[PDB]
Write an enzyme that holds these catalytic residues in place. Structure first.
Site, PDB file in Angstrom:
ATOM      1  N   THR A   7       0.623  -1.322  -0.138  1.00 24.45           N
ATOM      2  CA  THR A   7      -0.005   0.009  -0.047  1.00 24.45           C
ATOM      3  C   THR A   7       0.618   1.108   0.076  1.00 24.45           C
ATOM      4  O   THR A   7       0.541   2.073  -0.789  1.00 24.45           O
ATOM      5  CB  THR A   7      -1.045   0.160   1.267  1.00 24.45           C
ATOM      6  N   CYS A   8       1.704   1.392   1.047  1.00 26.71           N
ATOM      7  CA  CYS A   8       2.600   2.765   1.064  1.00 26.71           C
ATOM      8  C   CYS A   8       3.161   3.085  -0.351  1.00 26.71           C
ATOM      9  O   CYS A   8       2.852   4.419  -0.658  1.00 26.71           O
ATOM     10  CB  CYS A   8       3.466   2.683   1.933  1.00 26.71           C
ATOM     11  N   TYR A  61      12.178  -2.472  -4.897  1.00 26.80           N
ATOM     12  CA  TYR A  61      12.018  -3.609  -3.589  1.00 26.80           C
ATOM     13  C   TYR A  61      12.382  -4.921  -4.252  1.00 26.80           C
ATOM     14  O   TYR A  61      12.805  -5.729  -3.358  1.00 26.80           O
ATOM     15  CB  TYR A  61      10.729  -3.357  -3.372  1.00 26.80           C
ATOM     16  N   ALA A  90      -1.036 -16.143  -1.932  1.00 26.04           N
ATOM     17  CA  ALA A  90      -0.745 -17.488  -0.823  1.00 26.04           C
ATOM     18  C   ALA A  90      -1.804 -17.632   0.286  1.00 26.04           C
ATOM     19  O   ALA A  90      -2.353 -16.570   0.825  1.00 26.04           O
ATOM     20  CB  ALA A  90       0.626 -17.255  -0.420  1.00 26.04           C
ATOM     21  N   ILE A 112      -7.086  10.231   5.794  1.00 32.90           N
ATOM     22  CA  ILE A 112      -7.193   9.996   4.328  1.00 32.90           C
ATOM     23  C   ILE A 112      -8.377  10.918   3.628  1.00 32.90           C
ATOM     24  O   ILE A 112      -8.008  11.303   2.704  1.00 32.90           O
ATOM     25  CB  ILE A 112      -7.716   8.417   4.164  1.00 32.90           C
ATOM     26  N   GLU A 152      -6.921  14.576   3.611  1.00 35.91           N
ATOM     27  CA  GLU A 152      -5.972  14.663   2.849  1.00 35.91           C
ATOM     28  C   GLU A 152      -6.394  14.696   1.205  1.00 35.91           C
ATOM     29  O   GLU A 152      -5.968  15.853   0.562  1.00 35.91           O
ATOM     30  CB  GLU A 152      -4.716  13.489   2.813  1.00 35.91           C
ATOM     31  N   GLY A 179     -12.431   4.259   7.074  1.00 31.28           N
ATOM     32  CA  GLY A 179     -11.780   2.908   7.340  1.00 31.28           C
ATOM     33  C   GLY A 179     -11.236   2.085   6.550  1.00 31.28           C
ATOM     34  O   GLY A 179     -11.812   2.043   5.384  1.00 31.28           O
ATOM     35  N   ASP A 187      -0.530  -4.036   9.062  1.00 32.26           N
ATOM     36  CA  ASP A 187      -1.995  -3.320   9.346  1.00 32.26           C
ATOM     37  C   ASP A 187      -3.079  -4.433   9.630  1.00 32.26           C
ATOM     38  O   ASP A 187      -4.082  -4.050   9.910  1.00 32.26           O
ATOM     39  CB  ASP A 187      -2.488  -2.320   7.916  1.00 32.26           C
ATOM     40  N   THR A 194       2.969   2.861   8.321  1.00 39.93           N
ATOM     41  CA  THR A 194       4.172   2.288   7.624  1.00 39.93           C
ATOM     42  C   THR A 194       5.542   1.969   8.287  1.00 39.93           C
ATOM     43  O   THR A 194       5.964   0.723   8.642  1.00 39.93           O
ATOM     44  CB  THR A 194       4.659   3.036   6.221  1.00 39.93           C
TER      45      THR A 194
HETATM   46  C1  LIG Z   1      -4.127   6.535   1.345  1.00 43.80           C
HETATM   47  C2  LIG Z   1      -3.423   6.102   2.194  1.00 43.80           C
HETATM   48  C3  LIG Z   1      -2.195   6.918   2.759  1.00 43.80           C
HETATM   49  C4  LIG Z   1      -1.405   6.579   3.765  1.00 43.80           C
HETATM   50  N1  LIG Z   1      -0.386   7.510   4.155  1.00 43.80           N
HETATM   51  C5  LIG Z   1       0.453   7.184   5.047  1.00 43.80           C
HETATM   52  C6  LIG Z   1       1.561   8.023   5.519  1.00 43.80           C
HETATM   53  O1  LIG Z   1       1.654   8.955   5.151  1.00 43.80           O
HETATM   54  N2  LIG Z   1       2.418   7.502   6.526  1.00 43.80           N
HETATM   55  C7  LIG Z   1       2.369   6.414   7.040  1.00 43.80           C
HETATM   56  O2  LIG Z   1       3.055   6.092   7.891  1.00 43.80           O
HETATM   57  N3  LIG Z   1       1.295   5.355   6.679  1.00 43.80           N
HETATM   58  C8  LIG Z   1       0.736   5.663   5.798  1.00 43.80           C
HETATM   59  N4  LIG Z   1      -0.527   4.816   5.165  1.00 43.80           N
HETATM   60  C9  LIG Z   1      -0.698   3.406   5.726  1.00 43.80           C
HETATM   61  C10 LIG Z   1       0.468   2.410   5.397  1.00 43.80           C
HETATM   62  O3  LIG Z   1       0.282   2.421   3.938  1.00 43.80           O
HETATM   63  C11 LIG Z   1       0.356   1.034   5.901  1.00 43.80           C
HETATM   64  O4  LIG Z   1       0.184   1.168   7.083  1.00 43.80           O
HETATM   65  C12 LIG Z   1       1.432   0.181   5.471  1.00 43.80           C
HETATM   66  O5  LIG Z   1       1.424   0.067   4.230  1.00 43.80           O
HETATM   67  C13 LIG Z   1       1.420  -1.185   6.288  1.00 43.80           C
HETATM   68  O6  LIG Z   1       1.946  -2.355   5.537  1.00 43.80           O
HETATM   69  P1  LIG Z   1       1.640  -3.710   5.675  1.00 43.80           P
HETATM   70  O7  LIG Z   1       2.948  -4.518   6.176  1.00 43.80           O
HETATM   71  O8  LIG Z   1       0.543  -3.830   6.721  1.00 43.80           O
HETATM   72  O9  LIG Z   1       0.985  -4.424   4.363  1.00 43.80           O
HETATM   73  P2  LIG Z   1       0.664  -3.518   2.999  1.00 43.80           P
HETATM   74  O10 LIG Z   1       1.960  -2.303   2.672  1.00 43.80           O
HETATM   75  O11 LIG Z   1      -0.700  -3.162   3.180  1.00 43.80           O
HETATM   76  O12 LIG Z   1       0.676  -4.600   1.871  1.00 43.80           O
HETATM   77  C14 LIG Z   1       0.477  -6.120   2.241  1.00 43.80           C
HETATM   78  C15 LIG Z   1       0.878  -6.505   0.838  1.00 43.80           C
HETATM   79  O13 LIG Z   1       0.289  -8.267   0.870  1.00 43.80           O
HETATM   80  C16 LIG Z   1      -0.512  -8.250  -0.246  1.00 43.80           C
HETATM   81  N5  LIG Z   1      -1.566  -9.462   0.116  1.00 43.80           N
HETATM   82  C17 LIG Z   1      -2.785  -9.274   0.872  1.00 43.80           C
HETATM   83  N6  LIG Z   1      -3.524 -10.516   1.076  1.00 43.80           N
HETATM   84  C18 LIG Z   1      -2.888 -11.406   0.453  1.00 43.80           C
HETATM   85  C19 LIG Z   1      -2.811 -12.861   0.439  1.00 43.80           C
HETATM   86  N7  LIG Z   1      -3.971 -13.510   0.959  1.00 43.80           N
HETATM   87  N8  LIG Z   1      -1.691 -13.499  -0.176  1.00 43.80           N
HETATM   88  C20 LIG Z   1      -0.921 -12.756  -0.829  1.00 43.80           C
HETATM   89  N9  LIG Z   1      -0.440 -11.470  -0.682  1.00 43.80           N
HETATM   90  C21 LIG Z   1      -1.381 -10.777   0.136  1.00 43.80           C
HETATM   91  C22 LIG Z   1      -1.353  -6.865  -0.311  1.00 43.80           C
HETATM   92  O14 LIG Z   1      -1.905  -6.749  -1.796  1.00 43.80           O
HETATM   93  C23 LIG Z   1      -0.209  -5.923   0.092  1.00 43.80           C
HETATM   94  O15 LIG Z   1       0.502  -5.543  -1.205  1.00 43.80           O
HETATM   95  C24 LIG Z   1      -1.296   5.337   4.305  1.00 43.80           C
HETATM   96  C25 LIG Z   1      -2.319   4.304   3.874  1.00 43.80           C
HETATM   97  C26 LIG Z   1      -3.497   4.751   2.856  1.00 43.80           C
HETATM   98  C27 LIG Z   1      -4.208   3.595   2.417  1.00 43.80           C
END
Ligand SMILES: Cc1cc2nc3c(=O)[nH]c(=O)nc-3n(C[C@H](O)[C@H](O)[C@H](O)COP(=O)(O)OP(=O)(O)OC[C@H]3O[C@@H](n4cnc5c(N)ncnc54)[C@H](O)[C@@H]3O)c2cc1C
Ligand SMILES: Cc1cc2nc3c(=O)[nH]c(=O)nc-3n(C[C@H](O)[C@H](O)[C@H](O)COP(=O)(O)OP(=O)(O)OC[C@H]3O[C@@H](n4cnc5c(N)ncnc54)[C@H](O)[C@@H]3O)c2cc1C
Lengths: 461, 461
Positions: B40-41, B97, B113, B179, B182, B263, B304, B312
């Site tokens: 996501t980030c 990455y 997966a 969100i 912004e 949310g 998350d 992030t």
């Molecule tokens: C619009 C928006 C703006 C944001 N701005 C900020 C900011 O300014 N600063 C900040 O600190 N944070 C920000 N965040 C939050 C931040 O993006 C997340 O907290 C961060 O990405 C957490 O990452 P994660 O490790 O949970 O996994 P994510 O980064 O959510 O990615 C996990 C990955 O796993 C993949 N996946 C999911 N399910 C499966 C499955 N069953 N099998 C295989 N793969 C799968 C997903 O597609 C995803 O690519 C923002 C979020 C959003 C939505």
């Protein structure tokens, strides 16, 4: 009893705060000022400086814009309209500074003022004599003369750099100080062909090697010619009113203007300093103790006139600590430990603490943490700039003894690191701090490994 | 033994850190992303978001330049160019990455997966079955679908926001969190007629009162319609493809797009958790202890997906703490207090520590230091902006327990202030810190007198 409890000479940063707080306490005060109220910073220092820095920046904003999908119309810059604008704001500021004094009950005077007897003040505009218990000399400085160089009369200084007939096509700036590199990045931003000439090996000599060397590289890369280890012998005019400056090593250089920004000096010549018994050093500055008191009992000195650290918040702190000590019955010595500073060059410099070379002399094991990167905006703007972030750490107690930033918003960051180094935070405190994403400052909280070390004066890594 | 030492499900911030780190320790690691590496980030969060913020800020730059002697000819924004400029960058990042993982040795596969046993992972794309010793579920969440709202299938999420095929001439955004605010600011900046609607009493309800009320003021002052204490009854499409939204209180509002920004939810449905005994709370998040352990032995969860603070760096930190815990026999917990945060609205928010309301309850006696002022630039642009800078202090300690900034660079400031607060700095450390001039930040170091006090939860009048 005397004519006034307090007489303040100089209506600048230190004097106004002095005279105003004292009046606010019900003391009969008088303040003199020979030019305009507010002093250098307001009138021909920090305020206009930074306003003009903002004016120069808009050109970069326009180009960056392209990268984000904006097509921008043609843009014209009117030097006159800026000077008009600046003028109005500085009239405005001066207005209020004058009113603060009238409100607090102080008696405000338009003249140059000089010392007569031991606690007597000679007033020029009216030709009278006044007596005072305390006399505060917050007189400040002025741009260095260099009269011994032929043609100096043709040149300008910070004093007129703001109020010029026109934007030049090209300028020569001499010196390697913060005022020099500020104007170079101001005029360059505004399309002026800019050249910088300096005596020393590396510009900004008293700053950290990475700041000195990094600002150099970017300024050159953006097209400001820098001739280090060189000098002007003379300045004369061609039949065009343009200026011809003879160098030692880089031939001769023809510019619309020549700017001299080689140092400043205190306004002490014929102030009455031997006539009152006020011990002055060879630099011409007033020697004062921990309470800002001079050789003579009733006389105090504060601000640039003392030639310690020459910035605005320093004049203000001393004014306050003066009032605490002399009036509020609460002795307090102004502090000059660990002052953070800013240089409004493009890109900016923010620094607090000690240099790498200085830390290397002072301690025996020092760790250097260094970040250098393309700012996020640059990613799309297409600009070639790098932000450099350097922390210097003492290996023994893990203290951060110096923090140096080169890049966007570096000045603001300088302030805040100021507090962190003030309370003696450790590199460990930085590391435990959770990043904020996305920002630049998060580079300071994630450099878990040192870039390299320095042990006994030797870099190791 | 097993196919791998460590399977990582999810290629976002948490997972990538996890995999890369672990592989770089000579462990057999495998990682699966069902969409795009970087998560996501990178792809549709912090990174792209901040760019669009930048894109939106130039609008103000153009008008602001006028007061500085510039005349800029009309400028035009091209959405298709921004979105394209964005993809080029996220594609570049995505690739870095991917390159990072490979270089450490981890095996990259592009597939969703799911979970078979408690040490066995199925990979849908090949239809294969794989075993690992340890598993990390760094799966993240997704924007909430509101299947209960009629015509929800007509609305957009932040997934689609960045990539709309055209720029709406009008948008309506439901949601009150960071969100929502912004995007509303991004779109407004870009000339979209923007409306924001929220079911609660005030936006960013978790934020300090002066952050909330201040941003609200600046937003509607600049032409953003905010509608509080209200909800969307239903959405429907009109003849022209536009969206008609029905409201309890403000009738029916027509807009080009209707964004739901209320949310996110965790990707835990049909992930095979139940088969693996991995306990889940009623909001669908995986339950973990402070070392990211799920309720099944071989399995960890982080990011998350875990209910926690959804940012992030939190994900990243959790992942390092995991590598440490599981591999360096160094058990330590990420869970942390005093995380600084930013909101990239306009004006920005930057915040560390606790709100005035919280401190009033938690401590018997607090001191509040509040600064409100016209930024220097606004002195000339005429912008009509106010900077709010607010410090919250424990009267018993002198501890700064909260700092809140509304205005330019509040995010960079928050991060730095976060160092000071992590290390327990006192209001006194702040006051001893010499000012840097001219900055915004110096207002935090010269408020020697509190602006007001709160005792037993009630303010002194
Ligand atoms: C619009 C928006 C703006 C944001 N701005 C900020 C900011 O300014 N600063 C900040 O600190 N944070 C920000 N965040 C939050 C931040 O993006 C997340 O907290 C961060 O990405 C957490 O990452 P994660 O490790 O949970 O996994 P994510 O980064 O959510 O990615 C996990 C990955 O796993 C993949 N996946 C999911 N399910 C499966 C499955 N069953 N099998 C295989 N793969 C799968 C997903 O597609 C995803 O690519 C923002 C979020 C959003 C939505
Ligand atoms: C180009 C430039 C940029 C600068 N930028 C910064 C910056 O970014 N940040 C910063 O902190 N500082 C900056 N400074 C320095 C700052 O202006 C001074 O350090 C500060 O004003 C010192 O205050 P002062 O009151 O001691 O002297 P001043 O502020 O100069 O006050 C002295 C005043 O007294 C008057 N005076 C002198 N003699 C007499 C007399 N005999 N009788 C009556 N009146 C008299 C003078 O006219 C003068 O106005 C800058 C200076 C320059 C030149």
């Amino acid at each position: 009893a005397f004519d006034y409890d307090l007489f303040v000479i100089g209506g600048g940063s230190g004097g106004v705060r002095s005279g105003r707080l004292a009046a606010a306490l019900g003391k009969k005060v008088a303040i003199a000022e020979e030019f305009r109220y507010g002093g250098t910073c307001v009138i021909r220092g920090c305020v206009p400086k930074k306003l003009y820095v903002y004016a120069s920046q808009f050109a970069e904003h326009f180009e960056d814009a392209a990268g984000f999908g904006w097509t921008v119309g043609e843009s014209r810059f009117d030097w006159a309209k800026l000077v008009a604008a600046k003028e109005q704001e500085i009239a405005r500021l001066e207005g209020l500074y004058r009113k603060g004094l009238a409100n607090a009950g102080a008696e405000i005077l338009d003249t140059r003022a000089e010392l007569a007897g031991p606690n007597t003040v000679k007033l020029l505009a009216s030709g009278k004599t006044v007596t005072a218990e305390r006399i505060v000399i917050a007189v400040g400085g002025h741009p260095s003369p260099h009269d011994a160089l032929p043609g100096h009369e043709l040149c300008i200084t910070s004093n007129e750099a703001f109020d010029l007939p026109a934007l030049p096509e090209s300028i020569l700036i001499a010196g390697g100080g913060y005022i020099a590199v500020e104007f170079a990045n101001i005029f360059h931003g505004l399309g002026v062909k800019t050249t910088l000439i300096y005596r020393g090996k590396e510009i900004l000599s008293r700053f950290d090697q990475d700041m000195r060397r990094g600002l150099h590289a970017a300024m050159e890369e953006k097209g400001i010619r820098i001739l280090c280890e060189d000098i002007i012998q003379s300045v004369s005019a061609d039949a065009d009113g343009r200026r011809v400056a003879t160098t030692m090593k880089h031939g001769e250089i023809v510019a619309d203007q020549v700017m001299l920004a080689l140092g400043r000096m205190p306004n002490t010549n014929g102030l009455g300093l031997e006539a009152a018994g006020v011990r002055t050093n060879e630099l011409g500055a007033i020697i004062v103790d921990a309470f800002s008191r001079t050789s003579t009992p009733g006389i105090y000195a504060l601000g640039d006139v003392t030639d310690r650290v020459q910035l605005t918040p320093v004049a203000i702190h001393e004014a306050m600590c003066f009032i605490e000590t002399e009036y509020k019955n609460n002795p307090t010595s102004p502090d000059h430990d660990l002052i953070a500073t800013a240089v409004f060059s493009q890109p900016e410099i923010g620094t607090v603490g000690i240099t790498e070379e200085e830390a290397a002399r002072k301690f025996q094991e020092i760790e250097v943490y260094r970040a250098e990167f393309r700012p996020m905006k640059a990613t799309l703007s297409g600009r070639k700039e790098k932000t450099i972030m350097k922390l210097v750490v003492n290996a023994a107690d893990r203290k951060v003894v110096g923090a140096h930033i080169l890049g966007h918003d570096a000045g603001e960051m300088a302030q805040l690191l100021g507090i962190s180094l003030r309370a003696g935070c450790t590199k460990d405190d930085f590391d435990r701090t959770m990043a904020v994403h996305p920002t630049a400052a998060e580079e300071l909280v994630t450099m878990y490994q040192p870039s390299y070390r320095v042990r006994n004066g030797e870099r190791v890594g």
